[PDB]
């Protein structure tokens, strides 16, 4: 089924003239090095987008409504207003607090929020990333608080001991009073593997009403949107249906850089790796200049047997493509075993270098994920063959305008 | 015509074909080198521009090098400013450092207390929003809160706050309470950074933490990045070194880790360009079998015939790294000066570049080194061969 341009060309590559076997190894791994680091590079960026949908978007609410300092006398009617808006799935109130978790000779800034435990699971998955099973019996009377993982190693605390935090003293008169250090016990620890581990804490809503000495009053209304990309138009529609112009914001001004700077890598290393194959395509140019010189007598047989100039041009185009297909396909088969098994690879280098890469104190996550997609594998195979076609077209043009009369035919 | 026999055997081997394509395939090892050095200078200059932007904002303020004593408190009468003759510093000023908490009329917060002198100059002085540096009077216990610090606390101009030192405290037997003190604001400062979220400027003459002396000297470093070499130097007795690694140690380590990751990402172009010389010189020996074997018949040692192919693999690395550093220093300098169609950022507000003179030299000598190790193996096959076992 193969034509004359393909099926009668692999016998010409079987040439032995000394150290030519070393040229077939360097030119193979020279073009397979750029493909093997491009498959594991784009699959690693797909892993950072996979971990962003569940460990960032599913734990942080999109709606963020800071109203006037009058503590929400119309919060009951405001919960049903944003619920009937198309685009918003659910809604739940929250009270912003600021405390300092301390156990002795250590101070850590924490952000305490008061959410209802029987209402937070409808719009976001907070207990889906908790190590301990003690996520229930979260009601009034017990006075418990669950903290993250970043404050667990810094405070050197466990699940069960009593800690001392700070609460804001509520007073309508502008003066200074004594601080209150309420003694609460830790009822579990959660793990998000990121920045929300040392500055995140949640308390039940029934326990936050007695701290400010109020009744039924909240200090913020949170919600959840279905379309996470439209964080500009949908937020302005919910702010006017409830009250006047207040301090209304969204997650696009805070976590907008986490979704960013991964598509910049999709443009930076793409242009940086086609230059690697572009230098690797120069080995294909060097091996086709020689291929015309040593087989110059074989071209003189075709010029006497009735072959046009288009047939001789198509011989050396597919001759360099067969040498490029053996190197490009050898980089794909060594990229699947690294992308699918990256977790025993990255952890092996960290055991002999001491400091582990991608520390979760300032980065996105701690480990290095990898999500191999079959769409990105097809994008490199067209890219690796288009660079090999432009590099093999110019030696194929020189092999057709040669004079068969000046050579011995 | 040249008297040197080593260079006369390879000068006519550069350009031999009369066609323009025959000389284009001979200089392919040069184009692969100068496109990797240009990709290593222009990209890393953008990362150095983001690093210098984080140096004038995070390491401009929040002073790095303090000289704490063995017991913490340093007496200025025993250790004067004329005794600390360490290298790298340029100005010695009294300063104190201690983590405190905040207690306003609305909520609580945390911050870092910084006691500056009202007579000495400070980089926070031009960033003061209608605040005078001479307003810090001893005995009045004033405070200069930040912009983001007073915003979350609800503190305006003319509010009384309460600070408290949790580390250094007098352990009274009537309940273990820390030492607290009421502070009055005089104004806020704005710096458009993360410094004004926790920094507070108080007077240097205060006994809120302990005692009357200071904790250390404020050392302005000329290069605050290489503090590892400035900490293991000849240190005087009764003093300790405390750099910026206690607070922002993991922040600037991530910037240096991303520089080595992108630096290793762009160094693969030079490795394939070093592989191009092995393929180019690997085929030249197989076709010049009558030229190498006729040189040994004219009374030539095999040590000199190895240098004929050694310079041919080195001439592409010498002129490739010079042209790569020349074109790499013109694209990064004229990136945003000529025309902004090179790719607009999300803000586009004065995107900086940084061309380090010591970074260009260390990059180009590596490109002249990898091309040299990829030349000895094709040169060994052309020098250790046998003239009797040649083609004729």
């Amino acid at each position: 089924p193969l034509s004359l341009l393909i099926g009668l060309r692999f016998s010409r590559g079987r040439r032995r003239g000394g150290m030519v076997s070393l040229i077939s190894v360097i030119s193979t791994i020279g073009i397979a090095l750029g493909v093997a680091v491009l498959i594991v590079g784009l699959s690693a960026m797909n892993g950072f987008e996979r971990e962003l949908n569940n460990r960032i978007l599913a734990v942080v609410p999109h709606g963020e409504i800071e109203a006037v300092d009058q503590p929400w006398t119309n919060w009951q009617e405001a919960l049903d207003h944003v619920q009937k808006v198309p685009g918003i799935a659910a809604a739940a109130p929250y009270i912003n607090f600021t405390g300092l978790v301390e156990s002795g000779a250590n101070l850590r800034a924490i952000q305490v929020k008061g959410v209802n435990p029987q209402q937070e699971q409808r719009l976001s998955a907070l207990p889906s990333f908790v190590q301990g099973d003690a996520w229930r019996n979260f009601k009034a009377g017990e006075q418990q608080i669950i903290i993250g993982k970043g404050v667990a190693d810094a405070l050197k605390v466990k699940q069960g001991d009593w800690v001392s935090i700070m609460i804001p003293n509520s007073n309508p008169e502008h003066k200074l009073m004594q601080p209150k250090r309420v003694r609460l016990h830790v009822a579990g620890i959660l793990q998000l593997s990121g920045q929300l581990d040392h500055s995140f804490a949640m308390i039940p809503l029934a326990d936050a009403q007695q701290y400010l000495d109020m009744g039924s009053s909240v200090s913020g209304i949170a919600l959840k949107m279905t379309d996470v990309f439209n964080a500009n138009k949908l937020v302005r529609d919910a702010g006017e249906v409830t009250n006047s112009y207040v301090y209304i914001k969204s997650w696009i001004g805070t976590y907008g850089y986490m979704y960013r700077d991964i598509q910049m890598i999709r443009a930076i290393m793409y242009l940086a790796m086609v230059l690697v194959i572009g230098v690797a395509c120069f080995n294909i140019v060097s091996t086709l200049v020689m291929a015309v010189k040593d087989k110059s007598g074989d071209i003189a047989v075709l010029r006497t047997l009735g072959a046009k100039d288009g047939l001789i041009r198509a011989i050396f185009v597919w001759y360099g493509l067969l040498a490029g297909l053996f190197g490009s396909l050898c980089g794909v088969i060594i990229g699947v075993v690294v992308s699918l098994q990256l977790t025993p690879i990255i952890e092996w280098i960290e055991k002999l270098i001491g400091h582990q890469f991608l520390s979760s104190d300032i980065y996105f996550i701690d480990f290095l994920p990898s999500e191999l997609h079959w769409l990105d594998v097809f994008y490199v195979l067209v890219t690796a063959l288009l660079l090999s076609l432009l590099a093999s077209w110019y030696p194929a043009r020189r092999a057709s305008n040669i004079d068969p009369a000046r050579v011995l035919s | 015509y040249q008297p040197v026999a080593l260079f006369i055997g390879l000068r006519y081997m550069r350009g031999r074909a009369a066609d323009r394509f025959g000389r284009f395939v001979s200089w392919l090892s040069t184009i692969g080198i100068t496109l990797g050095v240009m990709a290593l200078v222009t990209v890393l200059s953008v990362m150095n521009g983001f690093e210098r932007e984080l140096q004038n904002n995070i390491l401009g303020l929040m002073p790095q090098a303090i000289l704490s004593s063995e017991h913490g408190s340093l007496n200025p009468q025993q250790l004067p400013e004329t005794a600390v003759k360490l290298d790298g510093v340029n100005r010695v000023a009294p300063i104190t450092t201690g983590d405190v908490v905040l207690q306003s009329a609305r909520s609580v917060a945390v911050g870092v207390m910084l006691g500056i002198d009202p007579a000495q100059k400070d980089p926070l002085t031009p960033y003061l929003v209608n605040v005078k540096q001479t307003d810090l009077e001893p005995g009045k216990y004033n405070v200069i809160l930040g912009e983001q610090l007073a915003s979350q606390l609800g503190v305006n101009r003319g509010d009384q706050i309460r600070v408290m030192v949790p580390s250094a405290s007098q352990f009274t037997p009537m309940g273990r309470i820390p030492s607290q003190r009421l502070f009055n604001v005089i104004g806020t400062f704005a710096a458009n950074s993360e410094v004004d979220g926790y920094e507070m400027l108080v007077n240097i003459e205060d006994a809120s933490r302990l005692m009357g002396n200071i904790t250390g000297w404020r050392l302005w470093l000329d290069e605050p990045l290489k503090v590892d070499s400035l900490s293991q130097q000849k240190l005087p007795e009764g003093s300790k070194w405390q750099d910026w690694r206690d607070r922002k140690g993991e922040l600037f380590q991530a910037v240096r880790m991303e520089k080595n990751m992108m630096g290793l990402l762009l160094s693969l172009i030079v490795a394939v360009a070093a592989f191009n010389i092995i393929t180019s010189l690997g085929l030249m020996v197989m076709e010049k079998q009558g030229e190498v074997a006729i040189l040994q018949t004219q009374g030539l040692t095999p040590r000199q015939i190895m240098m004929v192919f050694m310079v041919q693999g080195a001439s592409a690395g010498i002129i490739g790294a010079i042209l790569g550093a020349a074109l790499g220093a013109l694209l990064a300098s004229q990136l945003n000066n000529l025309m902004p169609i090179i790719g607009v950022l999300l803000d586009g507000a004065a995107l900086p570049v940084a061309i380090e003179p010591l970074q260009v030299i260390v990059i180009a000598l590596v490109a002249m080194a990898i091309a040299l190790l990829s030349t000895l193996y094709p040169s060994w096959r052309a020098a250790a061969t046998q003239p009797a076992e040649a083609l004729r």
């Binding site: 301090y247 914001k249 850089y257 700077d261 | 983001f50 984080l54 910037v255 991303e258 803000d347």
Partner: peptide, 10 residues
């Protein structure tokens, strides 16, 4: 990454 921006909007 290394590009930090703390420009908030109320």
């Amino acid at each position: 990454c290394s590009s930090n921006a703390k420009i908030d909007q109320l």
